[PDB]
Design a protein around this ligand. Structure first.
Ligand SMILES: O=C(O)[C@H](CCCn1c(-c2ccccc2)n[nH]c1=S)N(Cc1c[nH]cn1)Cc1c[nH]cn1
Ligand SMILES: [Zn+2]
Ligand SMILES: [Zn+2]
Ligand SMILES: [Zn+2]
Length: 232
């Protein structure tokens, strides 16, 4: 159908969107700093259970995500992966943990989360410490492209559906300016996106951390925006 926007989503609520067989995005909204912005995560079917990529941003949003999963899919979320250490991706980890979800992130993510005073996913993902590293995690591949929006950002690929979840390292087409880039490596960002490009040239669906999915041109768009900001 039509991809959900802040319009179709009351703040505190979560919509699911089916991208492919056994793949969904989860879309939530958050009011920051006067404005309302949407946020995407992923859900991937793993036999008779569910792998969750990223929290719905907050303990209350995350509890609403689980309820909305329990309602629309009715399969249990057994594992969750946070793609970076910011609160929009780990906020709700405690809720997940209380519901019996095993929470995972790279050591680099866990370290920064700890330093940040954020919630810390329980389990460590080994083998992602070097730019270009990939590891399998059930029905997805996890990929560390190098520093971009943050030094720890991961991307997620669903081989079975050619879905690339970029997380916050990839911007939607609508987004004309770099956001908060305080934690970013602007100097390495484009090289990291090129790694993503070179590793997943067959991706059919590209999901940005925020906003509307597209194809692989989201990667060039983000390059273009990051480079204009570098040049500001
Ligand atoms: O990228 C940005 O800076 C933000 C989105 C912040 C989401 N976020 C956060 C975050 C932001 C607030 C609280 C906790 C975590 N960490 N990493 C990311 S990505 N907005 C609003 C903004 C502030 N400055 C410039 N833009 C950008 C946005 C995305 N989609 C719609 N707006
Ligand atoms: Zn972030
Ligand atoms: Zn465990
Ligand atoms: Zn984000």
């Amino acid at each position: 159908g039509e991809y959900p926007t802040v319009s179709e989503i009351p703040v505190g609520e979560v919509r699911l969107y089916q991208i492919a067989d056994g793949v969904w995005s989860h879309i939530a909204t958050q009011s920051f700093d006067g404005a309302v912005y949407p946020s995407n995560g992923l859900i991937v079917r793993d036999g008779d259970e569910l792998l969750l990529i990223d929290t719905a941003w907050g303990a209350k949003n995350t509890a609403a995500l689980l309820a909305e999963i329990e309602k629309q899919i009715g399969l249990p979320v057994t594992r969750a992966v946070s793609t970076h250490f910011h609160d929009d991706r780990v906020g709700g980890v405690d809720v997940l943990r209380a519901a019996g979800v095993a929470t995972y992130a790279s050591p680099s993510t866990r370290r920064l989360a700890e330093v940040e005073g954020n919630e810390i996913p329980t389990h460590s993902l080994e083998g992602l410490s070097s730019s270009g590293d990939a590891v399998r995690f059930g029905p997805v591949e996890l990929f560390y492209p190098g520093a971009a929006h943050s030094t720890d950002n991961l991307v997620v690929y669903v081989p079975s559906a050619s879905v690339l979840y970029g997380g916050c390292a990839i911007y939607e087409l609508s987004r004309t300016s770099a956001g908060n880039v305080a934690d970013a490596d602007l100097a390495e960002w484009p090289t990291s996106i090129e790694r993503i490009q070179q590793h997943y040239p067959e991706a059919q669906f590209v999901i940005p951390g925020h906003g509307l999915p597209g194809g692989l041109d989201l990667l060039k768009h983000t390059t273009n925006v990051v480079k204009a900001h570098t040049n500001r």
